[PDB]
Amino acid sequence: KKVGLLVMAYGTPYKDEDIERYYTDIRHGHKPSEEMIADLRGRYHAIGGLSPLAKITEAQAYGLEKALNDSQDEVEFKAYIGLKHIEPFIEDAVEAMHKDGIEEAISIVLAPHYSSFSVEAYNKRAKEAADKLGGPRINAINDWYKQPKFIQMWADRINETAKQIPADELLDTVLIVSAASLPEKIKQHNDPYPNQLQETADFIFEKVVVPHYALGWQSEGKTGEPWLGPDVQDLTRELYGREKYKHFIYTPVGFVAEHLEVLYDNDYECKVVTDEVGAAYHRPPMPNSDPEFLEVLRTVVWEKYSNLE
Ligand code: FEC
Ligand SMILES: [Ca+2]
């Protein structure tokens, strides 16, 4: 019998006409203003029109399914994609499993770190849909940044970039490790998210030749409350002011694909800052559907399945 593999991600507009309803969904059903829509649409336009996140997420979910099924024959996995803010929604994926007769599923979020605003909400929605339908039972993975192959993947990508920096400028190079920002109040309740990112930065740093590093956040939202900082743009300016770094290497390790928050918030907004101070910009390829990353996810899911049984 088959075990459902519920692969969850944020979602992205398929078409330009979808941007309004996607943004409305992000804002809990409250339609943004015309100025807010125009600004978002202009960011998608700046990165080429739309984001490739849709096809990357699919390649990741079906590449993971194939890696799992080609590596063993104790069980057959069947992947279902459930998205947070556009169809197929999380609830649609759970419905489809139930209608297919899946009785047992493992879920994974395509974000390696846990927080109350991200993975918690994914898991709450998946379990609430399964409770109503009467199945499947969902066994959730909460985080997986500690996976050794995950850390080694990012260190290899950073070391390949650093090898193309001149040896006499490596001492003036800094590795900026980042994730999506969240409201700062999550620290008041000891949410694990900021600690998990610091841990990820520490594990990577001990495996790369780059001698300096700093932790930052990015892509904070339009609210009137404080968000986790420093922002990667502001941190770049500060570090140039104190240390005069010549090379900035940005690894937004909270993300797993090349989407709007990397293509715009790093490759446009951070490059604007490195240009202003006169430093070089580097941003290694994201994991996307590269086989080494599919192997990270296969290890994570197969270890989860091994520990249930
Ligand atoms: C955490 C976290 C992740 C990583 C975990 C996971 O991937 O789900 C995360 C991942 C992503 C990814 C990719 C994308 C890119 C989608 C694509 O079109 O390329 C992506 C894109 C957007 N996020 Fe995002 N996120 N995000 C928040 C937290 C997280 N976010 C919070 C909080 C709010 C604030 C909600 C509100 O305003 O009340 C919020 C709002 C937006 C908007 C709305 C427009 C704007 O104002 O910027 C867009 C577009
Ligand atoms: Ca921003």
Side-chain angles (χ1 to χ4, degrees):
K1 183 63 172 172
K2 321 174 145 206
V3 169
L5 180 61
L6 180 54
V7 185
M8 285 180 290
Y10 202 78
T12 193
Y14 301 108
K15 310 165 163 83
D16 171 77
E17 280 248 350
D18 294 324
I19 287 171
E20 289 73 13
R21 55 187 191 99
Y22 170 75
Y23 204 174
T24 296
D25 198 283
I26 293 163
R27 311 275 295 184
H28 317 298
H30 299 316
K31 180 164 169 118
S33 82
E34 163 190 293
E35 294 102 313
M36 300 160 68
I37 305 187
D39 184 61
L40 186 50
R41 173 168 281 122
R43 277 177 272 131
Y44 283 116
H45 284 183
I47 65 157
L50 277 154
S51 159
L53 186 55
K55 275 62 200 143
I56 296 175
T57 298
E58 265 151 68
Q60 285 170 334
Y62 299 134
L64 170 53
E65 187 201 75
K66 170 178 323 183
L68 285 163
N69 286 331
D70 291 4
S71 66
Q72 50 78 40
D73 187 45
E74 199 190 335
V75 68
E76 169 154 27
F77 291 89
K78 184 183 212 316
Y80 296 76
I81 298 173
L83 306 175
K84 201 188 256 211
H85 293 299
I86 203 163
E87 68 278 350
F89 286 97
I90 298 163
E91 294 80 0
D92 300 330
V94 178
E95 175 158 347
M97 305 192 281
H98 186 243
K99 260 38 145 183
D100 284 352
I102 301 290
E103 297 304 323
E104 272 272 311
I106 291 173
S107 66
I108 184 165
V109 179
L110 291 171
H113 311 98
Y114 182 89
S115 92
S116 39
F117 286 70
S118 62
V119 179
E120 217 175 270
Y122 283 105
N123 295 342
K124 197 182 118 283
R125 278 168 65 178
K127 302 206 163 103
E128 260 299 78
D131 284 348
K132 159 43 131 41
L133 292 155
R137 169 207 174 232
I138 306 171
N139 311 278
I141 296 155
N142 288 339
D143 54 72
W144 45 267
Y145 75 99
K146 282 197 148 227
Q147 168 51 230
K149 286 174 180 149
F150 175 71
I151 304 297
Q152 191 61 59
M153 182 187 66
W154 274 115
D156 290 340
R157 271 145 211 258
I158 292 153
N159 286 332
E160 306 155 19
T161 284
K163 275 183 343 193
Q164 305 303 299
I165 287 167
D168 49 20
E169 301 172 11
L170 189 69
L171 274 195
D172 297 304
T173 299
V174 61
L175 165 72
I176 306 301
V177 179
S178 68
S181 186
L182 289 177
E184 197 148 62
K185 61 182 161 173
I186 67 171
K187 302 227 278 167
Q188 291 161 23
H189 311 295
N190 204 24
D191 189 284
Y193 189 60
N195 304 83
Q196 294 193 353
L197 186 64
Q198 181 74 64
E199 283 190 4
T200 301
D202 304 347
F203 302 150
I204 295 170
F205 183 63
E206 61 191 29
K207 287 142 195 107
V208 299
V209 298
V210 177
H212 306 283
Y213 80 113
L215 180 64
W217 304 92
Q218 62 188 71
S219 318
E220 58 152 323
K222 189 188 190 292
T223 55
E225 40 162 0
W227 283 56
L228 298 169
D231 184 81
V232 284
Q233 305 161 87
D234 314 340
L235 169 70
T236 303
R237 312 186 173 272
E238 141 162 19
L239 291 177
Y240 181 80
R242 340 201 299 251
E243 317 292 340
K244 298 287 174 281
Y245 291 129
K246 292 177 199 294
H247 300 266
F248 291 80
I249 303 167
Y250 298 85
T251 56
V253 306
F255 300 121
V256 301
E258 284 152 354
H259 47 58
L260 187 68
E261 310 302 68
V262 176
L263 297 171
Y264 194 85
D265 296 16
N266 297 111
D267 296 344
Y268 177 58
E269 287 184 335
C270 293
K271 166 114 200 313
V272 163
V273 178
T274 58
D275 273 0
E276 316 205 325
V277 304
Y281 176 81
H282 309 267
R283 196 277 289 160
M286 308 292 294
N288 296 332
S289 63
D290 300 341
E292 166 173 42
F293 185 58
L294 297 187
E295 190 37 43
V296 173
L297 297 177
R298 186 209 61 78
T299 302
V300 171
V301 173
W302 185 250
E303 281 183 10
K304 176 63 166 190
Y305 173 77
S306 298
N307 202 27
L308 298 170
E309 293 299 291

